[PDB]
């Protein structure tokens, strides 16, 4: 409720007169750091291509992952692409497809 040095804590925004720290609305908005924003930030919705991994809280935006069938790597900024269903002609599977990676193959 009390700002310190004109910044409010994570999960809160500052009031218009700079004297109150107001809680973000859980499941609707968030702030992750000590800020002087007059508004909390809008939570990202995992619409169609992506399913929700973790919900939005006041201090944390929601985290998405691609649905089963598609994958994206660890810190990969790339868009989400389809997993192969089988290895090419003359190779074997040594790893299954997840949200995290493609199927892994190897020769003979």
């Amino acid at each position: 409720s009390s700002p310190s040095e004109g910044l409010c804590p994570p999960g809160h925004h500052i009031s218009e007169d700079g004297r109150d720290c107001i809680s973000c609305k859980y499941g609707q908005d968030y702030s992750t750091h000590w800020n002087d924003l007059l508004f909390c930030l809008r939570c990202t919705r995992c619409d169609s291509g992506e399913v929700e991994l973790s919900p939005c809280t006041t201090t944390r935006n929601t985290v998405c992952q691609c649905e089963e069938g598609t994958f994206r790597e660890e810190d990969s900024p790339e868009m989400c692409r389809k997993c192969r269903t089988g290895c090419p002609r003359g190779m074997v599977k040594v790893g299954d497809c997840t949200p995290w990676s493609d199927i892994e193959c190897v020769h003979k």
Partner: antibody
């Protein structure tokens, strides 16, 4: 959803007057404020003014000081830029944006903008 | 008051490329810097505020860094939606001032 809609643009003579309005929806102007920013055709962004309607506090670009006046009507959730003594060089798209922060001039939810042309 | 100088004026790049836009203040502005994106016929959008913090709905391939004089916007892997003009802003003092823009076009 937040939305800002500029109106009032048009072609006027040098020395003339124009009043821009910015209708806000989805948030209280009284709990934040509004910025005006302009982009001359083919150029970059030049901030012109801000208003904090809670305490009536205003600030202006040096280019614009004494000639433009920013005001607000919290009952109508609208801000206005009264532009007087207009010069050719004021020609630009004028955007309004919401005051996102208490001290910093961070701007979000910019409107589509309104074109102001000053010519004889 | 304070000039912000962006560099480069323009660059061409491919989808996937790492892109680095730099802004230089003529004075110490600490971390009081934002970055904006603008596409033709459209209004600017906030990407980043206070030098390194992402605005709502901005993907994680966007990164801001810097303090004092030298600031940086990074796009780790360029996407089709990322070809636009980018503008730095300082808000350390009134009036806030903008760089002249970096146009990011597509290489073919």
């Amino acid at each position: 959803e937040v939305q800002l809609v500029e109106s009032g643009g048009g072609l006027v003579q040098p020395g003339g007057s124009l009043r821009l309005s910015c209708a806000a929806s989805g948030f209280s102007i009284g709990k934040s404020g509004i910025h005006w920013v302009r982009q001359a055709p083919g150029k970059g962004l030049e901030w012109v003014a801000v208003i904090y309607p809670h305490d009536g506090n205003t600030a202006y670009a040096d280019s614009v000081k004494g000639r433009f006046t920013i005001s607000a009507d919290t009952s109508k959730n609208t801000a206005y830029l009264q532009m007087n003594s207009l010069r050719a060089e004021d020609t630009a798209v004028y955007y309004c944006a919401r005051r996102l922060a208490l001290v910093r001039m961070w701007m979000d939810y910019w409107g589509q903008g309104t074109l102001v042309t000053v010519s004889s | 008051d304070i000039q912000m100088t962006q560099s480069p004026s323009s660059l061409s790049a491919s989808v996937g490329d790492r892109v680095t836009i730099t802004c230089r203040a003529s004075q110490d502005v600490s971390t009081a810097v934002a970055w904006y994106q603008q596409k033709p016929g459209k209004a600017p959008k906030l990407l980043i505020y206070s030098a390194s913090f992402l605005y709502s709905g901005v993907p994680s391939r966007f990164s801001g860094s810097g303090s004092g004089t030298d600031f940086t916007l990074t796009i780790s892997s360029l996407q089709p939606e990322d070809f636009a003009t980018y503008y730095c802003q300082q808000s350390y003092t009134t009036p806030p001032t903008f760089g002249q823009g970096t146009k990011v076009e597509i290489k073919r």
